[PDB]
Design a protein around this nucleic acid. Structure first.
Ligand SMILES: [Mg+2]
Ligand SMILES: [Mg+2]
Ligand SMILES: [Zn+2]
Lengths: 52, 58, 203, 74, 820, 168
RNA sequence: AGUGAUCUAGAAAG
RNA sequence: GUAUGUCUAAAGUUAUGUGCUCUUAUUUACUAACAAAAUCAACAUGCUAUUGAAC
């Protein structure tokens, strides 16, 4: 059985059709953000430590 | 421009005039019908005006 | 620029006809809105696929983690949450504390199915049948007046045009089989001529 | 829309066969090639990252298409 | 099949082969589909298999940037309060830059009407707009989609991004504010270009003079070498990762501004029915994109140079170096990289090596990449534009040294950040075997030859700079100039675009577009055009085709109808007012000898010629060449400095009368000192890069992107050309002999005018109806133009033409001329 | 013959002056030279609605319409024209006329648009006076409110900036 | 102290 | 690229039940398929502030 073809671009006969027919994260991102967060912490603590 | 102002150009009007002079040709559908009938004297041309009224009522 | 309830209903009814790739047609109804704004309104509020339901506790955990793993990248976070972006931004913030006339035009346009030249064509058909019935009734009046005018056949558009009443136009007789058809042939001829006399006198 | 239609069947050449040619001389049907042929029969330490420390049958992902896009879109 | 047809038609378009007018925009369409499709595939693969940048690379990049900004004692840019002193000046500069687009346009669609509505709202209500901008900076983190379009430049299409107007006002404010505060805080070192202080021809001039003024640079007696590396940072903008960008930006700007910038890049991109989120890479069309581009560029600069040599080039933070200078010769000669600059994504390095340093680098490269075949000469990028005699000579030692220099530098930047490839790199070596040092910068092909390496020191024309040793003020080298081939193709594509878009239009519009294009070429490249014969050929063809557009408008290409007086007579005398570059003689030479060595001008080709032989002047004779501009500017500004000091000592005004005669000299012009806008222009930092980046935001960007008249002044003056074309065409009495002038019965030309001098265009009602655009210019209608020049257009001595007589007159037409 | 023909054929006896005089005598009797309107193609200048059948007519729809020069002129000098179309559904005549003084159009018959010479001269003079010429305590109280609103905005923004730091 | 090298060219329909 | 469509003049009836005279476009002027991608030429040589009745 072949379904009826409903286009999202075309409507030759002007049919109003039911609306519903007209309508995970990779781990590297976590590792990258975590590493940059730790590098930022290193920067903060180094400038704080040598501020004395 | 359209057919109407081409047909009402000076050359076409002059050719109509020359044709009604040189050979008696006159397409009466171009011309306004006489309001008063009695000013028309020829039986031929009066009958042609009658034909114009006939096609108008059709 | 605020969106009215009537404008939202017009947009949904318009997308039912036009789909999600013809926003200039949608905006031709919404008189104070552009196509750009209409596509925004659909895609971010009125599309039924959007999930505006309250977040589960697991969703709040997921959203806070993603907001750390992909900082400020709210369209990416939203695509991962499978929710609208402004919803995700508001949630993240929570967790860290005369119009009748337009509707009349809308209904008139959207319930029109015919299009322009088809409407002109049915108008033309109406006029043609009007002229036909004019000839028919005039012929009937003149027949009552006792001056029997014949009906005028249509003018040939080209020199070889066909009148389908004069001939069986491309007669393809049945090929003769083994069985004799003669008796029922003369019966059919009787039937046809009887019908012709009947329509002549009874109409 | 109803003027704008797909081809359900093609026109049969049997129709053209049913009547005779009408004598128009086409230029491409003038004589030409009138005979048939026949066959015989220290400064490098100061940087963080220095070393001191194919065809596929998809036109769009092929390296030629990638190079073409990098050349002609800029 | 569709993608194959796209490939084939693109090749035909970029060749200049026959292509239909509709086919060009069809190809534009198909190719923009294919580019978006490929970019979507790239973004999805980044999401699937992860970021290109490793965590180790990210943490050490962050460490390098932190080390730099700490060593500079950089104070990060704060968020601007409403009490900020420069708020109204920053906003008025932003709104002026935004309004400059629509002051020069008439096709105002709804978005661009809304633009002007918001701009006039903002001019009316500065405080309201400041408050709105700042609350959006603090709070808004989700943005409307960006439409992308592509612009058909006939060598390649280029992207253009349409941002929402209300967002665009915020982005313009932020761009202005960031560039101002970054100049105040000295974020960007001297080597980062374009700069507010230099037009691009002056950057090329200062680079060449800087090379010549390095100590011991030209000596080769000890086996020294100089190496000049030019390459692009390939794919730099599209490889910017947003979390690395956000944590990098937080080192220099307030977290609210960094978060705004980061979120503003993460937007939906739309084209027709195609739509995707930009999840990776900078959108070049954002108004602040130049800032992001230059700061990410500074990260890459620090990776290339290292901390130590970067501090050498930039100098101590409390009194930094000016561009290409050092605090002493000891600091200069400490390290092989003598000079660095980056113009956007093009880096330039000069290395000076001792003989043993060069040997060491070369044997390292050959240790890892040995060449027993001597195949290294194959695929070595070399300058086609110069003869074989004077381009780089591919000796074994120099080729290997250049490959080693590249091979060293390519390691220094991760591939995840930038795509540095040999195929996009040029490495010229100056040595005992190579006397010429070559590079290409800003569209100028440059070849430096020292006087000590010239076999005979001849005198030269314009288009050869003499480079001066500033220690003695003596000339010590020559720099030969040409236009880059890609810039010649760009000019040809521009004239081609004019020709295509000008079907059945007014002739004076075509002439005006040609004039604008020719002026933009000649005022930019100036003297580099002289030695560039392919450009002269292209110029002649282009002017001929521009005239052919007029001729085919009149359905007749016949030369005798259209003498030079028809085209080159000024507009107020009824001509098209074209400016000429094509009536020159073109230098001609033996092709083989010219491929091999500098033949010299032995012969001349005829350029454009007409049987009415007239000495039409050239545009080139009225523009001061850049060498003379820069030398005169140095003299002029030093003189002004001395005058300024004595005026300060007197405590009286350094007068207008005291600087007259020097008023219209200098780069920037002396006149810039005294313009009334000087006090508001002082805050418009970053204007030049902003003007160059407009190519990504706006369709049909200006051809004069390289100079800002407000900051640089008026850098050319073509008033004399009009007088000289009038005299060249035989004077006014000769010009009107071609015209229907005496058919009017007027006695004399003087006192006659075309415009009817009505007061309607001064009406307030007209101002209400036409407020978007200035309207001083006036076209000549085609029928009036044809009637005016009718005694020569309908002349009697046609080559062919069927003689017919107009009805009921004794007028004869020789052929068919439309509108006559 | 082509569109752009240069010459037309005149008979050898053709005198142009006599021909024009004869054609002028003829023109007073031809039907289509003396009918009261000129047929034209035009776009609908504004959105309008038919009153017979309530059909909406959008702007920029092309029609075949009738043009009439009217007897009356704007300020006795400038030509006014009536422009008449017919409704696409029901064929009823819709008419509107030009309004030269406003540089606009005004509706006449059959439809409705969506959304005196002495008096006119006086109004024009007064308009020119406005063109050339182009509560005190209430305005001061508005200046008080404006200055308060301006100075309080910085504190509001600083509260948002601090709130963002707290949220972070 | 002067040798020469010389493209074109218009009509219809859309 | 100056759309295009229909209509009619038919035939009478097909057998039964010349003056005068304005005109410096004083024209109801008509057509839009055609093209639209406009910015070189700007901008003067030097910035402003003013008047209440009466007890
Ligand atoms: Mg056609
Ligand atoms: Mg067409
Ligand atoms: Zn109606």
């Amino acid at each position: 059985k072949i379904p009826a073809a409903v286009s999202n671009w075309k409507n030759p006969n002007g049919y109003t059709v039911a609306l519903e027919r007209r309508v995970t994260i990779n781990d590297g991102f976590m590792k990258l953000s975590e590493a940059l967060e730790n590098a930022d912490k290193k920067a903060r603590q180094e400038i704080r430590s040598k501020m004395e | 421009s359209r057919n109407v102002d081409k047909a009402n150009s000076v050359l076409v009007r002059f050719q109509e005039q020359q044709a009604e002079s040189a050979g008696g040709y006159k397409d009466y559908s171009r011309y306004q019908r006489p309001r008063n009938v009695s000013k028309v004297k020829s039986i031929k041309e009066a009958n042609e005006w009658k034909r114009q009224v006939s096609k108008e009522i059709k | 620029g605020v969106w009215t309830n009537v404008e939202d209903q017009i947009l949904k009814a318009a997308v039912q006809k036009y789909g999600t790739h013809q926003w200039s047609k949608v905006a031709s109804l919404l008189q104070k809105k552009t196509a750009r704004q209409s596509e925004l309104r659909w895609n971010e509020y009125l599309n039924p696929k959007l999930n505006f339901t309250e977040f589960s506790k697991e969703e709040d955990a997921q959203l806070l983690d993603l907001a750390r793993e992909l900082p400020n990248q709210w369209r990416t976070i939203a695509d991962m949450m499978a929710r609208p972006a402004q919803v995700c931004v508001e949630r993240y913030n929570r967790l860290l504390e005369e119009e009748k006339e337009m509707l009349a035009e809308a209904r008139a346009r959207l319930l029109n199915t015919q299009g322009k030249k088809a409407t002109r064509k049915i108008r033309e058909r109406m006029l043609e049948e009007s002229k036909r019935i004019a000839e028919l009734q005039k012929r009937r009046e003149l027949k009552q007046a006792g001056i029997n005018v014949a009906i005028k056949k249509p003018k040939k558009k080209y020199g070889t045009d066909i009148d389908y009443n004069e001939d069986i136009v491309y007669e393809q007789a049945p090929m003769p089989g083994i069985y004799d058809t003669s008796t029922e042939d003369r019966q059919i001829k009787k039937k046809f001529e009887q019908f012709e006399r009947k329509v002549n006198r009874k109409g | 829309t109803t003027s704008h239609r797909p081809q359900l069947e093609a026109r049969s050449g049997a129709k053209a066969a049913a009547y005779t040619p009408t004598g128009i001389e086409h230029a491409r049907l003038l004589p030409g090639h009138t005979t048939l042929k026949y066959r015989k029969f220290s400064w490098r330490k100061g940087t963080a990252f220095g070393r001191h420390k194919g065809y596929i049958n998809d036109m769009t992902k092929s390296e030629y298409h990638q190079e073409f896009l990098h050349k002609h879109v800029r | 099949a569709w993608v194959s047809a796209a490939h084939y038609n693109r090749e035909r378009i970029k060749r200049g082969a026959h292509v239909e007018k509709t086919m060009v925009k069809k190809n534009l369409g198909r190719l923009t589909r294919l580019w978006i499709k490929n970019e979507q595939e790239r973004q999805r693969q980044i999401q699937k298999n992860g970021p290109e940048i490793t965590p180790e690379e990210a943490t050490t990049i962050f460490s390098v940037m932190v080390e730099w900004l700490e060593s500079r004692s950089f104070s990060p840019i704060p968020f601007p309060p409403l009490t900020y002193k420069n708020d109204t000046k920053i906003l008025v500069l932003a709104l002026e830059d935004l309004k400059d687009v629509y002051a020069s346009k008439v096709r105002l669609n709804a978005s661009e009407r809304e633009e002007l509505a918001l701009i006039e709202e903002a001019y009316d209500n500065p405080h309201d707009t400041l408050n709105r901008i700042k609350k959006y900076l603090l709070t808004q983190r989700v943005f409307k989609p960006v439409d992308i379009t592509m612009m058909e430049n006939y060598q390649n299409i280029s992207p253009v991004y349409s941002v929402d107007p209300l967002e665009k006002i915020t982005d313009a404010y932020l761009d202005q504010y960031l560039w101002y505060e970054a100049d105040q805080r000295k974020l960007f070192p001297n080597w980062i270009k374009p700069s507010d202080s230099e037009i691009p021809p002056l950057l090329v001039y200062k680079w060449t003079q800087g090379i010549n003024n390095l100590s011991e640079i030209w000596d080769v007696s000890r086996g020294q070498s100089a190496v000049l590396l030019e390459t692009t940072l390939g794919e730099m903008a599209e490889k910017i990762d947003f979390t690395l960008l956000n944590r990098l930006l937080r080192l220099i700007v307030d977290p609210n501004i960094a978060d705004y910038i980061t979120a503003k890049n993460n937007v939906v991109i739309n084209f027709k029915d195609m739509s995707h989120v930009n999840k990776y890479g900078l959108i070049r069309g954002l108004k602040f994109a130049s800032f992001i581009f230059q700061y990410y560029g500074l990260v890459i600069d620090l990776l290339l140079l290292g901390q130590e040599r970067a501090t050498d080039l930039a100098g101590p933070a409390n009194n930094p170096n000016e561009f290409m200078q050092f605090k002493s010769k000891e600091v200069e000669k400490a390290h092989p990289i003598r000079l660095y600059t980056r113009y956007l994504d093009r880096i330039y390095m000069l290395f000076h090596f001792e003989e043993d340093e060069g040997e060491e680098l070369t044997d390292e490269y050959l240790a890892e990449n040995p060449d027993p075949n001597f195949e290294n000469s194959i695929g070595y990028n070399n300058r086609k534009c110069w003869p074989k005699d004077s381009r780089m000579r591919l000796i074994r030692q120099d080729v290997n040294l250049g490959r080693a220099v590249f091979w060293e530098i390519q390691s220094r930047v991760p591939t995840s950040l930038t795509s540095i490839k040999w195929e996009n790199a040029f490495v010229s070596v100056y040595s005992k075997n190579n006397p010429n040092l070559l590079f290409s910068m800003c569209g100028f092909e440059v070849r430096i030859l020292p006087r000590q390496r010239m076999e005979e020191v001849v005198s030269n024309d314009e288009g050869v700079w003499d480079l001066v040793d500033e220690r003695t003020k003596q000339r010590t080298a020559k720099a030969y100039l040409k236009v880059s081939e890609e810039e010649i193709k760009k000019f040809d594509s521009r004239i081609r675009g004019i020709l295509m878009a000008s079907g059945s239009t007014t002739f004076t519009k075509v002439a005006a577009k040609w004039n604008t294009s020719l002026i933009s070429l000649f005022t930019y490249f100036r003297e580099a055009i002289v030695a560039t014969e392919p450009l002269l050929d292209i110029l002649v063809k282009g002017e001929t085709r521009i005239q052919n557009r007029v001729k085919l408008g009149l359905n007749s290409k016949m030369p005798t109808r259209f003498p030079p007086a028809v085209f080159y007579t000024p507009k107020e005398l009824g001509g098209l007012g074209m400016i000429s570059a094509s009536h020159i003689l073109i230098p001609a030479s033996d092709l083989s000898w010219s491929k091999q060595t500098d033949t010299g001008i032995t012969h001349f080709r005829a350029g454009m010629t007409h049987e009415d032989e007239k000495l039409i002047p050239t545009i080139f004779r009225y523009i001061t060449t850049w060498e003379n501009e820069f030398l005169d500017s140095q003299r002029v500004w030093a003189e002004y400095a001395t005058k300024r000091q004595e005026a300060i000592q007197q405590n009286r005004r350094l007068a207008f009368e005291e600087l007259e005669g020097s008023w219209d000299r200098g780069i920037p012009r002396i006149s810039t000192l005294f313009q009334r806008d000087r006090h508001t222009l002082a805050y418009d930092r970053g204007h030049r890069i902003r003007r160059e980046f407009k190519q990504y935001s706006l369709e049909r960007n200006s051809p004069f992107w390289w100079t800002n008249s407000h900051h640089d002044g008026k850098l050319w003056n073509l008033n004399a050309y009009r007088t000289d074309v009038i005299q060249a065409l035989g004077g006014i009495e000769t010009i009107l002999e071609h015209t229907l002038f005496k058919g009017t019965g007027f006695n004399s030309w003087e006192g006659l005018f075309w415009e009817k001098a009505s007061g309607f265009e001064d009406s307030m009602q007209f101002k209400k109806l036409t407020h978007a655009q200035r309207t001083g210019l006036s076209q000549i209608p085609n029928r009036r133009f044809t009637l005016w020049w009718s005694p020569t257009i309908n002349r009697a001595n046609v080559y062919v033409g069927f003689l017919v007589q107009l009805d009921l007159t004794g007028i004869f037409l020789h052929g068919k001329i439309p509108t006559l | 013959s082509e569109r752009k023909a240069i010459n037309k054929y005149y008979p050898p006896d053709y005198n142009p002056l006599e021909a024009e005089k004869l054609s002028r005598k003829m023109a007073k009797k031809l039907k289509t030279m003396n009918k009261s309107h000129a047929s034209i193609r035009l776009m609908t200048p504004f959105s309008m609605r038919c009153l017979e059948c309530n059909e909406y007519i959008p702007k920029s729809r092309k029609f075949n319409g009738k043009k009439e020069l009217l007897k009356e002129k704007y300020l006795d000098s400038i030509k006014i024209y009536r422009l008449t179309i017919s409704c696409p559904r029901c064929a009823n005549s819709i008419a509107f006329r030009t309004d030269p003084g406003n540089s606009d159009y005004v509706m006449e018959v059959g439809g409705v648009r969506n959304y005196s010479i002495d008096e006119t001269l006086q109004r024009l003079v007064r308009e020119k006076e406005m063109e050339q010429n182009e509560d005190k305590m209430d305005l001061l109280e508005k200046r008080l409110a404006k200055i308060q609103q301006e100075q309080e905005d910085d504190e509001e923004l600083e509260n948002l900036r601090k709130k963002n730091l707290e949220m972070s």
